[PDB]
RNA sequence: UGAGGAUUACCC
RNA sequence: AUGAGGAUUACCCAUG
RNA sequence: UGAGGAUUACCC
RNA sequence: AUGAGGAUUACCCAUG
């Protein structure tokens, strides 16, 4: 094992899939970046800490760039026009079983599944109504 | 459209699925809960707001019950030993088109996809190694 | 669904029934008013809040007007001679099941049923004795 | 008349009905309790007073036990996890005739009638949406 | 029941119609935004308040963008070249019945009906002459 | 050619229609008043001005009276029991072509079209819910 | 500028 | 939070 | 209140 | 620790 492996972050059906690979584990923050210049790369970071005596907390962050080429000083540089940031924090009691943990993972997958309320609102630039 | 509808939060293949239904809309914050007491319910809330001049931001919260050894309908204390909390914040620059927003949703689904590093660490009560 | 619907507040057997319709949900306070000028309308408001970590509290208010026409400045205005106010607050533990909640609703219905002590005292302008 | 009599608080169709009977009259505050320990009893109290020069006011309180997972006759702590509290205040201007007062009672019954918004939100552990 | 829904702001036959969907109802201010980049979106907000003892006051706001692409340093972004701002306040005494309100609404639709002096001055970059 | 003419403010079929005729165009403020007693008349005013270097700004005002008879000392006079006041400001940058202005006009007519959220809240003495 | 008020081209 | 505290009723009071 | 301004629920 | 607090995103704020 080693769950520190690369995965496809944006599955565009085999063509133009954005895959992210392990790139740093310094300070206990696991990082994954796409194969781009660091200025245009996608980024995922994960870290877990025993926040309380009875909790463990996972901090996950994803950065999705909008790439561009910018003329700075008459010279062109690979750049990100902007970035979208996902910041998630999951707090799990120490009493949670592995099957209890699997229930949390399934709830997060269902939440974001296509056609469900939230992924729909997001993709359409609206709120829930 | 009208996205404020009931959906399957935990998919257990049609039998024993957890469905979550609209339960509150006070202040534009959409809420969905499962058919349980509130101490044992699966809960989801969502809201969008323009956080600043350049960004809009979604606040999505999920509460998941510890199910192993649970007494249905019972009084289970302390509350913290029996619940997991997910808190997601998605910041999106005002320039993101619907297409841009569709890619952000894909990035979120890929991150949580089965077999990928993050949902595997979580499901196995682990960190990255 | 959407439980935010109109209902008959005063059932006068089909003729002169006072029905109340959804009219505002600003600030998370659901409101219903009868089809009258705002000065003569019946009003119902409901709001729920997690008052404690372990309670939820519902605040319900009903205003029953005694309508009149008042000559003010030589001109006649639709007005309410007076108003009767019902203020109710229900505190429910988070541990209460849906069936536990149904028991509370049945107790409130039985309390006010015709012929029972309390609705009798009220309608006769007396106390319990 | 003489309205201080026993009545059915929870109607379960003749079988398993909860009847509440007079239990105290200290200070003109009528009390009715079910046949249980006081920690598990259904309790109702009522009193009228002229709150001010223009109004009379009824204070009606109801305590309902959490029944799911209850141990009959047992010591259940904390007390707050096992009980719901209803507190109603009805303010009525001194000009209200018996007829006016009969309409106020109808407004109260309509509000709590089955299928109407409020008792449906309560029974389903919900707010308005 | 709900009136906080999607609606056609600009009716361009049945194609090129501008639809504005619910986005946020924080602090009694309902907001509606059109789809795609928030930067190029149409925006509508609305709120009511009891301005004084006898008046209720509505505040409606509409923003019509002039869609354009901004190019700076080779990096292009979707922007609104400029925006028009409509601001309206409608004061209504509490004595107005539903019939009075319907008439106020007809007066507003009449003012802006095609061919009438006001909508004709505006559509032509003109004043009254 | 002239747009300072008579027009139907309230279209009530073809009978009971409220027509407002030109009355005064002093100081760049065009005024229109309905017939009969000025005390019970509908009033519409309009003016444009270059609010800033890039903007032109329209100020429109409408008054809908509640017709009534005032009786004081036996002397009765035709009055408006009260009035509703509509006030709108429309800011338009000088870069707007005639086509841009026509779209602004369509957005205004769309907002108030029958059945849409806003004209429906108003005609019903309501807010957004 | 103001989801500031109004006896509504007034006032804060 | 509490009040058989008040109201002109989504406001105010007192106590803690 | 304002035929006060605005980068528009801000400001005067 | 908490925030439908903010960000230029493993940083900052406020409260407790």
Curated annotation (Swiss-Prot), chains A, B, C, D, E, F:
It holds the Pfam family Levi_coat. It is found in: Virion. One of its GO terms (molecular function) is RNA binding. Changing residue 82 to R: Complete loss of viral assembly. GO terms for biological process: negative regulation of viral translation; regulation of translation. Keywords: Capsid protein, RNA-binding, T=3 icosahedral capsid protein, Translation regulation, Virion. Coiled coil: none annotated. Residues 31-104 are annotated as: Viral RNA-binding. The keyword NAD does not apply. It comes from the Viruses. InterPro entries: Levivir_coat, Phage_RNA-type_capsid. GO terms for cellular component: T=3 icosahedral viral capsid. Changing residue 78 to A: No effect on the organization of the T=3 capsid, but with a loss of thermal stability. Complete loss of infectivity. Capsid protein self-assembles to form an icosahedral capsid with a T=3 symmetry, about 26 nm in diameter, and consisting of 89 capsid proteins dimers (178 capsid proteins). Involved in viral genome encapsidation through the interaction between a capsid protein dimer and the multiple packaging signals present in the RNA genome. The capsid also contains 1 copy of the A2 maturation protein. Acts as a translational repressor of viral replicase synthesis late in infection. This latter function is the result of capsid protein interaction with an RNA hairpin which contains the replicase ribosome-binding site. Belongs to the Leviviricetes capsid protein family. Homodimer. The capsid proteins form dimers that assemble by group of 5. Twelve such pentamers are linked together with free dimers. The homodimers binds to the viral RNA via an operator hairpin, but also to many other RNA sequences in the viral genome; this interaction probably shifts the virus from the replicative to the assembly phase and ensures specific encapsidation of the viral genome. This is Capsid protein. The lineage of its organism: Viruses, Riboviria, Orthornavirae, Lenarviricota, Leviviricetes.
């Amino acid at each position: 094992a080693s769950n520190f492996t690369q995965f496809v972050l944006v599955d565009n059906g085999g063509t133009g899939d954005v895959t992210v690979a392990p790139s740093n584990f310094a300070n206990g923050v696991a990082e994954w970046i796409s194969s781009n210049s660091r200025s245009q790369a996608y980024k995922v970071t994960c870290s877990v800490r025993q926040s309380s005596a009875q909790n463990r907390k996972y901090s996950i962050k994803v950065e999705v760039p909008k790439v561009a080429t910018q003329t700075v000083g008459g010279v062109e540089l690979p750049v990100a026009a902007w970035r979208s940031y996902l910041n998630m924090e999951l707090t799990i009691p120490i009493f949670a079983t592995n099957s209890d943990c699997e229930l949390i993972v399934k709830a997060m997958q269902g939440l974001l599944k296509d056609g469900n309320p939230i992924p729909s609102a997001i993709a359409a630039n609206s709120g829930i109504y």
